[PDB]
Structures are given as structure tokens and as C-alpha cells.
Symmetry: C11
């Protein structure tokens, strides 16, 4: 099962080679600072290891503070996320979540907690190689990214989008799996 599977030579070789790849400009985004968006990291991990080849859990989440300054809330929240592969290999790291200025205590806490968990997951997956987000920390890679042409955001083709719940091929394979 999970945590018991040992990587075969072919799969080990494919993943080890693939994880060295640096990410193209399609993955990187910027704010006012470069970063990779959460769903992109999720999709990267799902493609690298399979939907059932990686796992993550929240070891502990701790609210550092909730302060009130003339009607505005300032909240800091840390989270400890541990990623595990289907072979037992694991990486655990710290994420943080901040919410300053909001008037809603509850919305501030929601933003801070969710942000902390997502950040922790990104930083835990980072430790597997450049393909999962390590290259973003290399300043030479950032410069080589700035010299690249700023391409416009690609468009998504919703023609083959999932339109009904049923997955007939999946149901067939699962019925044949028993």
C-alpha cells in the first residue's frame, strides 16, 4: 500500500531525471517577488508522482497572535506540513500565514490559517528538486527568467472539460479491479 511501495528502477530513473528540470516562465508569477501558485505546485506533484504517489498532512498548526489596533486585526499563523511519497520518503517544513488590516476577526483567521497551510505544502514539496519549486530560489535562474520574453497568459480550452460525474473508463477499470 502507501508508504510500502518501493520505487522500480524505471520509475526512479524517470522521476530523478524529471525533478532536475527547471520551470519555464509559464509556471512563475509575480507580485509586488517571484513565486509559484499553489495549484501549479499541486499539479506538478500530481504529474511527478501520480495522484496516489504523494501525500501530505498537517502535523501541527499554531496561531502565533491575534492583535487589535483601532478596529483592524493582525494575525500570524504557522503550520507544519509533511509530504510523503509512496515509498515512505518524507519532507516536512514550516509555512506562515498573515492577515493585516481586515475588520473581520474570523476572515483574518481563515486567511491566515489557509495561507499558512498552503505555504507549508509548497515549502515541503520544494525539497524534492528544482521541478517542484527549488529552482525559484536560485538568483541566477531568476535573472535568466527576466531575460525571457514576457508571454501573455495562455488560454484554457474548456471544450473537453468534464461535463458529467460518471467516468466510464474509470468505472470499468475499477470493476475489473475486484
Amino acid at each position: 500500500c502507501f508508504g510500502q511501495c518501493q520505487y522500480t528502477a524505471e520509475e526512479y530513473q524517470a522521476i530523478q531525471k524529471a525533478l532536475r528540470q527547471r520551470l519555464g516562465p509559464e509556471y512563475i508569477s509575480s507580485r509586488m517577488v517571484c513565486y509559484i501558485e499553489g495549484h501549479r505546485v499541486i499539479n506538478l506533484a500530481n504529474e511527478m508522482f501520480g495522484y496516489n504517489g504523494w501525500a501530505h498532512s498537517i502535523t501541527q498548526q499554531n496561531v502565533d497572535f491575534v492583535d487589535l489596533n483601532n478596529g483592524k486585526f493582525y494575525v500570524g499563523v504557522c503550520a507544519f506540513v509533511r509530504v510523503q511519497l509512496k515509498d515512505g520518503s518524507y519532507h516536512e517544513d514550516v509555512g506562515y500565514g498573515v492577515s493585516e488590516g481586515l475588520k473581520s476577526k474570523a476572515l483574518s483567521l481563515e486567511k491566515a490559517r489557509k495561507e499558512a497551510v498552503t505555504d507549508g505544502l509548497k515549502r515541503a514539496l520544494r525539497s524534492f528538486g528544482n521541478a517542484l519549486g527549488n529552482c525559484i530560489l536560485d538568483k541566477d535562474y531568476l535573472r535568466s527568467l527576466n531575460k525571457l520574453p514576457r508571454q501573455l497568459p495562455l488560454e484554457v480550452d474548456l471544450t473537453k472539460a468534464k461535463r458529467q460525474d460518471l467516468e466510464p473508463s474509470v468505472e470499468e477499470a475499477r470493476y475489473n479491479s475486484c
Copy 2:
């Protein structure tokens, strides 16, 4: 049993391909936020049915690791409640994803309904955010702004109608009863 079943090549490959699909406009809904901005989301029951179809009714599981009420404040007769929950989804092979949901209830005068609303919302949100990590088909694509742009350019479709003619009308499931009798 559960957590021990190992995925066969056919089911693994089918699921891996199927999870890449982004969701059509049938799944996505929208509300208005505190900044007057549009926020998309998938309704709970849609995600539950999506997961039941992707993994089988017995191929996925979820549990509440911890639910914690952050605060209960009383402002001139109105209750403001924040509740977080940690939901862990597991597949029949032991693979798991755990995330946090939050639940908010501001303005209500009934403390009990505020707490109920916050707790249930927190748990459902945590389940959705935990299931997100399995792929676009279970809700990962909703975070892609390009997917959102491609969704607005689409015609606002009218609510589909449900045909309740073959709806279940009595408890017994005879084919199910036979299949189970033959299992003992």
C-alpha cells in the same frame, strides 16, 4: 481491506487521466465578497459526487482530525464566531491529503445557530480543500485565473432540470441484496 488495496494499472491510469479534466460551467457557482469582487467555488454535494465517481463509494474516505472554535464574541446582541477544522482524506491505497477548513458566522443573534453554521461550514470547506490536492477534476483548476477567464467568456447557462421519474421510491435494492447474499 481499506488502506491495503493496491491500485491496478488500468484503474490507476484511468484515474490519473480523468483527474486532469477541468470542470465545465455546470459545477462552478459564484458569490460576492467583502470587496465587491466575484469569487467562484464548487458546492459540497458536487464535490462529494465527483469523488464518489472518481474513486468509488468505497475508494475514498475522510475524517475530522481536529475541530477548534477560535472565538465567540458578543457585539451588541450579535454573535461573531470563527471555527477551523482539519480534514484528512484517504484513498483505498493509503494515500492521503489533509487540509484546513474555516467557518464564519457574523451578525446572527442566536449563538447556537452561529456555532452550528461555523462548525459545519468549516468541516465542509476542509473536505473540499483536502480533495483539491488530487487534481483539477476535484477542484484544483478553480484556483487558476486563466481557467476563470475562460469560464467568464462562456454563456451563462440556465440551471439544468432533474428528471425524478426513476428516482428511488422504496428502501429495498434487490440487485444489491442478491450481490450481497452471494458474498457470504
Copy 3:
């Protein structure tokens, strides 16, 4: 034993198909839920019988992970009580779904009746919300507003009558007793 048996292909397919079924109007009832509007729901005993038919009396299980009384407040002689419960349903293959229920009692003068109402409602609500996660047939469809529109357009049927002629009248079960004697 329980939690160890793996579903056979025939029973898996039967149950997966049956769980997709939406519920007819015989199951749906209405009360005034949280929010003060008319809200549809499935009665507890109906969900119990639904689950017993879907999985068998020994094919599903549930337990109360934790029940916590959030508060008991007294406002000029009336009691206001909120109670949450965490109920986890498990199938005979180890598959599980856990959710939160809440129980409310505001205004009553009897503390004991208020607490009893809140605790029992919390447990039953948690069980229903945990069973929701297996498919439409166990209560997931009730959350689809399109399903509600398709339910209102249906002819309002009168409550069916129960024929108590073949009702159980003595304790002994000879058919069961024989199979059990031969099972040892």
C-alpha cells in the same frame, strides 16, 4: 470480520449504481431549520433504513468520536443550549466518513429536556451528515437546488399507509435461530 472484508465486484457494482439514485418524494419532509425558512430534509429513521438496505445490518457502522456541549445559558428562566457531535460511519471494508452534527434548544424552561434535545439532535444530525458522503441515495441529492425544483413540480402525494397485519408479534425468530444454530 468487520473492516476487513473486501467488496466483491458484483456487490461493489450494485452498491455504486444504487447510490447514484436520487430519492423520491416519499423520503423528503420539511421543517423550519436554521435560518427560519422552509427547508427539506430526510427523517432519521428513513436514513437508518436506507443505510441498512444499502449495506446490510452488519455492513455499516457508526460511532460517536466526541460530543461537546458548547454552552448552557439562562436568560430569564429559559435555557439556550448548543451541542456538537462528531459521528464517524464505517463500512465493512474499512471505508469511513466522519462529519459534525449540531443540536439546538432555545427557549425551553426545562434544562433536562433542553440538554436531551440538543445532545440527541447533535448525534442524529452528525450521523445523517456522515451518511451523506456515500452518494445521492443516502442524502446527498437533498442539497441540489435543481433537485428541489424538480421535487416541487411533482404531485403532492398523500402519506402512504402501513399494513400491520404481518407485523412481528412474538420475540422468537425460528428462521434466524436455525441458521444461527447451523452457523456454529
Copy 4:
């Protein structure tokens, strides 16, 4: 041993069939509730014997997960006590159902007797509500509003008589001792 035995096809089907039965009027009793209304219920010993017949003396089990005294109040010499209990019933195959019972005692001048009544009543109620989840035959049908009306239309029968001629009069059980000696 217990929790390990798997139900055989014959015993499973027999029990699944028997549990669908609604109960005849011999089981149901009634009192006058709060608002000058009628409320039906099944007495504890009836449910105990029903379970012993359905599963065998060694085919079902129950335990008290937790009992918590909610309150003990003193108003001018009278004690008012509320007690909840969490009872978990388990079958010989590991299947389980857990629910909450409550126990109330208002008016008594003895704190000890109030607590005794409340605790025992809570536990018995919890056992009844836990056994309810196995099917109609163990008490689920009592929740059906149509079933109660269909029960009122039957002629109210007078208490059947019990013939104590074959009552056990001395301790020794020779057939049991013989089979048990043959068990070694």
C-alpha cells in the same frame, strides 16, 4: 472469538429479513407526554429480549463509552438531575452502533435516588437508541409517523397472560452442563 465471527449467508439473510419487520402492539407501550399528548415507546426488557432472539445471547454486546452527569440542582428540598450516557452496541462480527441516551429525575427529595434514576434511565435509553440503528425490528419503526397512526387503528388488546408453570425453579441446568462438558 467475538468480533471475529463472520455472518454466514443463511444467518445474514435470515437476520436481514427479520430486521425489516415492524413491531406488533405487544411491544409498544404509551404514556401521556407534556402537552396532554400521547407518546409510544418500547420497554427496555422487550428490546433486550428482541436483541437476544435476533443475534443470540452471545451475538450482540454493548458497553458504556462514557456517562456524564450534566447537572444536579436543589430547589426547596427537591432534586432535579440530568444524566447522559453513551452506549455502543457491537455484534459478533465487529459491526457496531453507538448513540446517546438521557436520564432525568425531577422532584425527588433524595439526591441519591435522583442520581440513581437518572443514571440508569440514561444508560437504558442509550442502549435502546443504539439498538434502533439495526433495523425496524429493534425499534426504528417507532419513529415512523404513519406507523403510529396505523397502530392506533388496531383494537387495543388487553395484556396477554404469562403461564409460569414451566418457570425455572432450581439453579442446575443439566442440558447446558452436558453440552459444556462436551465442549472441552
Copy 5:
């Protein structure tokens, strides 16, 4: 060992039949309750002997899960003590039943004797109520009001006399010592 032995068909059926037996008048005793009314009961030693005969000296077991002193109050020189106990009986196959006993001592001037009486009574009562759940032969029939009337209609027999001629008079048990020597 204990909790592992599985009941053989003959012993299962013998015990299942024997537990249906209602108890004769030799077992029932009576005291007066608070409202000056008759309350029936089975004495502790009677239940112990019944259980030893039904299952064997090594076929049933009981343990005190938890005992909690609810209160010890002093009212003008008299002590009033209430004590609850949770007793769990288990059979040699792992089957179990757990229930609550209570112990009361009101009026005594000695705290120590009040506590002793309350604790011991709680434990014994809990054992009786746990054994009750196996069937009429172990004490369930005492709860049937119809069974009680048929007991009043019976002639109250004078206390049976005990023939102490075959009483054990010295420690050695040669047949037992021999059977055990042959076990090594």
C-alpha cells in the same frame, strides 16, 4: 484461553434455550420503596449462582470498569452517600454486557460504614444489571409487569430448607486434585 473459546453448537443452543426460561418464585424477593410500594428483586448470591450454572465457573467474568462517589453529604449528624459503579460482564467467547449499578446509604452516623455500604451495593447492583441483559433466566423477566402479576397469582411458598448434610467440611478435594494432576 478466556475470551477466545468459541461456543459449540450444542452449548450455544442449550444456553439460548435456557436463558428464555422465566424465573420461579424461589428467586424473587421484595422490599418497600419510598412511596410504600412493592419492589421485586433478585438477591445477589442468587444471580451469582444462576450465572455460574448457565456458563460455568470459568465461562463468565466481570470487572469493575469505574466506580465514582457522587457525593458525601452531612446533614445534622447523619451521612447521605450515593455511589455509582460500572460493571462489565464477559463470557468465555468475548461477548460482553456493561451496565451501571448504584449504592445508597442514608441516615447513618458513621461515614466509613456509609461509604462501605454504598460502594459494595453499587458494585453488586451493577453486576446484577449487567447479567440481566443475557435473558430471563439471569433476571430480565423481573422487568415484565405482566410476569409480575402472574407471580402474585401464585401461592407464596414457605422458605425452602437447606440440607447441610452434604456440605463441604474439609479443604482437600481429591477428585479435583486428581483431574488437575492429569492436566499437566
Copy 6:
């Protein structure tokens, strides 16, 4: 080892029969209660010897689950102490019986003697009450009022004399040493 050995048919039946025996007058002792009534009991060493002969020196065991000093009060220079103990007896097949003992010391001026008396008495009483549950031969019959009447009508026998001619006089046990040397 202990707790695993399963009783052989011969030893089971021998012990089951022997435990039914009531005790002769050699075992019973008496003290006086204040109301002019007589209270019977079996002395500690007598119960220990009874158990050693019934089960063997290595066929029964007991342990102190918990001992709790309820109170130690000082009233005008005199100490009044109540102590409870929970003793669990276990047989070599895993069968067990657990009960409560109490120990009392009122009036003594030495706190140390009060505590020692109460603790030791509690433990011994708990052992007696736990062993009682195995049958009449180990002390259950002492609670039967008819057995008490049949005991009082018997001629008061003079204290038996002990023949110390074959008493153990030196440490070495040669037969035991030889049997154990062959056991390695």
C-alpha cells in the same frame, strides 16, 4: 503459562461440581451486630486455603487494581478512617472476577494503626468478595438466609485441634527440589 491454560474436561467438571458445595460449620465464624442480630463470615486464611485447594497454588491469582483512602478524620484526638480496595481474582484460563473491599478503623488514637488496619482489611475483604463470585464453595452460600437457618440449628462444635507432628520444621524440600531438577 498463566491466563492461557484452558481447563480440561476432567478438571472443569470436577471444579464446577465442587464449587456447588455449601460450607460446613467448620468454616463459618460469627460476631455480633448491635441490634441483637448475628453476622456470619469466613475467616481470611480459610478462604485462601479453600481457593488453594479448589484451583491449586498456581491456578488462581489476585491483584490490587486500585486502593483509595476515602478519608482520614481527626475527632477529639481519635482517628476515623475509611479505605476501599478493588481486588481482581483471575484463574489460570483467563477467567476473572473483580469486587470491592472496605476497611474501617474508628476510635483509635494512633493514625498509623488506623491506616494500617483499614488498608489491610480493605484488601482482604476485597479478595474475599471477589472469590465469592465463583460459587458456594468459595463463600457465596454465606449470603443465603436458608443456609443460615440450617447452620444455626446445628450443634455448636468445639474448636478443632491442629496436629503439628508433621509440621514443616526445616527449609529444604527434597521431593520438590528433585521434581524441579527434572523440570529443567
Copy 7:
């Protein structure tokens, strides 16, 4: 190893026979209680050697489950200390007996010496009372008043003399060392 070895028939019967023996006057010692009455007891080392001979140096074991200092009081320069200990003896077959010992120290000016005396006495007394439960040969007979009377009528023998001619004078044990070298 220890706790797993099962007693062989020869050793079981030999030990069972030997444990029935009462002790001669060589073992019994006496002091005067605080009320001028005669109190018998067995010295610690005598009981230790008794157990070593009955079961072997490696056939019995004991451990201190818990030691609790009940009180340490200071009255005009003198310390009064009560300490209880719970000692559990176990045989190589898993059989066990647990009892309580007490240790007292009144009058001493040194708190440390008082505590040392009380703790050591509590533990030794607990070991004696735990070993008592194995039979008369290990100290059970000391509680029989008839044995005490038969002890008084026996001639009080003068303290035996110890022959230190065959005493161990150097550390080395050549026979033991040889038997052990052949054991590897």
C-alpha cells in the same frame, strides 16, 4: 523464561503437597502488642528462605507496584510516619498474588531514619502478606487461632545454633562456574 515456564506434573504436585504443611515453632517469633497481648509473626529472612526453597531462587519474583507515604507528622520534636507498600509476588508460570504492607515509625527524632524504617518495613510486610496467599507453608497458618493454641502447648525450643563451618569464605563458586561454562 520467567512467567512463561509451566509447572511440570511432578513439580506441581510436590509443591502443592509441601505448601499444605504448617510451620513448626522454629519459624515462629513473638512480641507483645501495645495492649499486653501475645502477637505471633514470622521474620522476614525466614519467609524469604521459605519461598526460595518452595519455588527455587528463580521460581518466584516480587516487585513493588507502589509505595505511598501516608503521613509524616512532627509532635514536640518526635516524628510519626506511616508508609504503605503494595508488593506483588509472581511465580515462573505467571501466577501472582498482590497484597499491602505497612511500615510505622513513632518517637524517633530523625525524620530520615523514621522514613527509612517505615518504607523498609512497609515493603517487607507487603512481601510477607503477598507470599502468605500461596499456602500455610509460606505463612498462611499464622492466622489460624487453633494453630496458635497448638503452638503454645508445644515446648518452646531454645534458639538453634548455626554451624558456620561450611560457610562461604571466598567469592569464587567453582561448581557454579563450571556448570555455567557448559551452558553456553
Copy 8:
């Protein structure tokens, strides 16, 4: 699985030799301390990639045993935060090294960013110091003063340029998917 793999002779020897290598100037960075002096270090991503190449992406793992915030102080509008972390790295053969990292933030006006900086720095520092213990190739050589001197004498090379032509541009990994499909 992980923690079970034993290093093969070829892989052990390869890694043992490779870890002896000291690092070239491409890895080392430097800053100025609070007292105007040069401090060398290895950046986090370099250590992560070094370890991934030395042991494989699945041949090393690390976990946070505990993170403890030492202090958060507010001095006239500036926050000073010290946080320690204990990081444990493990290899696929069970070999492990655990060390401490620290995180500092002095002067900042935002508490949230101070805490984020201190916690993340503590964890990364602990990871670097834990990996340091495996050899020079993973960072031990940075502590050799002679290695630092021999590094300064080297020509300061210009920052290398990165060729992003072969960068990953889409999610799909066909070779990886193929090998994994062949792994089921």
C-alpha cells in the same frame, strides 16, 4: 520501503567516496557580520540539490522534531524574535542525524514577518546543520579554516548564467507516467 533499504556495496562505496569531496566556489556565499567580518555559508537550495543528487530524491528525508519560539520582544516599536528548531534527517537505510537550527529577526516593525522569518530560517538552518554531519560534500568542509583560506586565494568567478531553453514548460511527464504505468 523507506528506512528498510540496505545500501548495496556499489552504492555505499560511491556515496562514501563522493561525500569526501570538498565544495567548489560555486556553492559558497558570504556576508558581513555585525562586527565587520566575513561569514561563509551554503544557500539552502544548493544543499537540497546536493542531497537529492547524493542520495536520490527518495533516499533522504527530513522532519521537524520540534520548533520552539524562544522569545518575541517588543522594544519601542521593533520586534526581536528568536526561534530554535530541531531537524532530523534520515537516509533510506535508517541512518539519521539530528541537529539544531536558529532563526533571528531584530528590528522589524511587523510582528508577523518577524515570526515568519525566524521560524523559516530556524527550520532551514537546522536542515543544513543536520545534513552537514554526512560529510564535506554536504557542507562539513565549510568549518575548516584552511579550506576557507584556500577558497579565498581562488579567482572570483562571475555568476554563472542559466540556459532556460530545456526548462520544463508543461505539466505532463510522459516518460515518468510510462515507467509508473509499468510499475503497477
Copy 9:
């Protein structure tokens, strides 16, 4: 390994015989207690060597279950410390003996030395009292007053001198290294 080995017949009997031996005057020492009385004891190292020869350096073991400082008092400039320790000796067959030692230091002005003395003495005393329980050869006879009288009648011998000519002078143990190399 340790705790698992079962004693072979030869070594068992050798040790069983050897443990009966009383100790010659070379082992016994004496001090003067507070009442000017002669108190006998065996020095620690002698008991350690006794055990090392009786069971082998690897045939017995001891551990400190708990050490508890009873008090540390400061009375007019001097420290008075009492410390108890619970030492459990175990043999290579799993047999064990646990007892309490005490350590005292009264009068010293340095707290640190008082604590050191009390703790170390408590541990050593506990080890001596635990080893005593195996038989006379390890110190049980020292408690026999008859043994003490038989010790006084012997001539007080002068301290034996130790021959340090064949003393160990370098670390290496060549025969040991050879035997160990041949064990791998």
C-alpha cells in the same frame, strides 16, 4: 539474550545449592548506630562481587525504577536529607526482585555533598536489599540473630592483605579479543 535464557539443570542446581551458604566473617562489617548499638552490614563491592560470581557478570542485572528525594531541610545551618530508591534486580532468566533502599546525610553544611551521599547510598542500599532476596549467600543470613551469635563466637581475624603482583596493568585483553573476533 538477557531475560530470555532458561537455566539449564546443572547451573540451576549449582546456584540453588550455593545460595544457601552463609557468609564467613571476611564479608561482615559493623558500625555504631545512634543508640550506641552494633549494627552489621555487607559492603557494596563485596555484594557486587558475590553476585558476579554467583550468576556471572552478564547473568544478573539491576535498574533504578525510581529515586525520590523525601526531604531537604535546613535547620540552623545544617542540611538533613532523606532519599529513597527502588532498585530491581533481574536474572538472565527473567526472575526479578525489587526492594527499597534509603540514603541519609545529617549534619553536613554543604547541601551538594548531602544530596550526593543520600542519593548514592539510597541506590546502593536498594541494590543490597534486592540482592538479599535470592538467598543467604547474597546476604539473607545477616538478618538471622542466630547467625550473628554464631558469628561472634569466631575469632576476629585481621584484615587480609591483597596480592597486587598479578594486577592488570594495560587495557588490552588479548584472549578476550581473540574469543570475541572468533564470535563474529
Copy 10:
């Protein structure tokens, strides 16, 4: 895996011989203590490399059992911090050594840097002292005063130069990667 491997004769003998070697002056360093004196020590990275060469990168491991900050004092604006750490080193055969390290930081005005220095120094010192216990080669000889005098009499060598020509300049390890590919 780790903790399971048994040392082969060749590797055992090699390591046992190698650990006796004392360290040359290349390893030893010196500082000035509080009395203007010479204190010798081995720098951390040297000890890490020593252990990695003696046992292999995967043949030794260490963990931090506990680190405890003893004190943080503020004396006229400067911080003085003492921190202890407990480091446990384990070999691939399960052999282990645990010792204490300390860390000090006096004079700094930054609390965070003081704590960082003290914690890191404590952990490194504990690792050095734990590895010391394996033999002279890992640092035990540094405690021999004769070793120190014989160290002064040797010619003080110039700091060796480091040859960075073959330093690792890129991440990939082709020999390691190939040896690992052949291991799956």
C-alpha cells in the same frame, strides 16, 4: 537496516584496532581559559569526519534526546546564557552512547544571537562527548595528560593547505547515480 546490521569479523576487527589510535597534532587545537591556561580540544568538523571515516556515512547516527535552556540573564545590557544538550550516538548495530554537552554565551547584547550560540555549541559539544566514548580515535585520548605532554614534545606543524583542484563543482554524481540505478 540501521540498528539491525551485525558487524562482520573483518569490519569489527578493523574498527576495534583503528579506535585505539591516538590523534596526531593535526586534530588538536587549544584556547585560553579563565586562568590564562591551555585547554586542548578537537574541532567539530574534525570529529564528524573522523566518525564518518571510522563507521561510514551510514554506519553512525546521532539524535538530540533533549535540549534545555538553563538560564537567560540580563546584566547591565549584556546577555549571559547557558544551555545544555543530551546527544545520543548510535551505530549501525544498535550500540549507543549518550552524553551531555553545554553551551555558553556571555557579553552579547543580542539575546537571539546569544541563544543561537549557546544552543548550537551545546549540541556540538554533546556530539563530541558522545562520540568520545567509542575510543581514542574519536577523542578520548584528549583527556590523557600523558598524551598531552607527549603532544607538546612533537614539532608543531604548519597549517596544512587544502587542494581545491578536484573540488566538487556540479551537483550530479554519475558514479553514485549509476550504482543506485543498479540497486532497484
Copy 11:
């Protein structure tokens, strides 16, 4: 592995013989202890080397069960610190010895140095006293007063000189690496 290996006859006998050896004057040193006179002791590194030679680098292990700082007191600028530690030594066969060490620092002005001295001394002292229990060769004889007298009569030899010609000069151990390479 460690804790599982059983000693072979040859190695057991060699080690048992070697442990009897008393130590020559090369090992013994003298300082001013808590008795206020010339007190003999074995230096830490000597005991470590003794153990490494007696059992092998991988044949003995020790751990710190607990270290507890008893007190830190400040008297006119000087610190008085007492620290105890519990060290447990174990051999490769599971045999173990656990004892207490103490560490003292009185008079020093630096709190950090006092705590460091006390903790390290406590751990080292505990290790020495735990190793004492294995025989004279590891330090038991140092307590023998006759051994001390026989040590004074020996010629006081001058500090031995160490031959550092074959001192270890580089990290690599080629023979060790070869023996390990062939072990995989």
C-alpha cells in the same frame, strides 16, 4: 544486533576471567573528595578505555535515563550547584547496570561554568559507578580497603610516557573501508 547477541562460551569465559583483575597503580589517581583526605579514583577516559577493551567498541552501551539539577544557589557572588544523573550501561546481550552519579560546583563565580561542571561530572560519575558493577577490572576494587593498603605499599611509579610515533594523521582508514566494503 545489539541487545540480541548471546555471548559464546569462549568470549564469556575470557571476559569473566578478565573482569576479576584488580587495577595496577597506572590507573589509580588521587584527589580531594567529599571525605576531606587523599581519595583514590579512576579517571574517566581510563574507565572508557577499560570498557572498550573488555567488551569491544560495540559490545557495551550507556544512556542517560534522567539528569536533574537539584539546586543552584547564590551566596555573595558564588554559585553552589548540585546535579544528579542516572546512567544505564547495557551489554550486547541485554545485561544492564544502572546507577547514580553526582556533579558539584561550589565557589565559582560563573553560573554557566558551575552548571557545566556539575552536569558533565554527574554524567561521568554515573557512568563510572554503573561500570563498577561488572567487576574489579572496571572499578569495583577501588572500594576495597585491603586493595588500597596493598596499593600504597607499591613503588610509586612515574607518569608513563606515550609513544605518538604511530599516531593517527589522516581521516581515511583503508583497511577498515575494505573490511566494510566486503561486508555489504
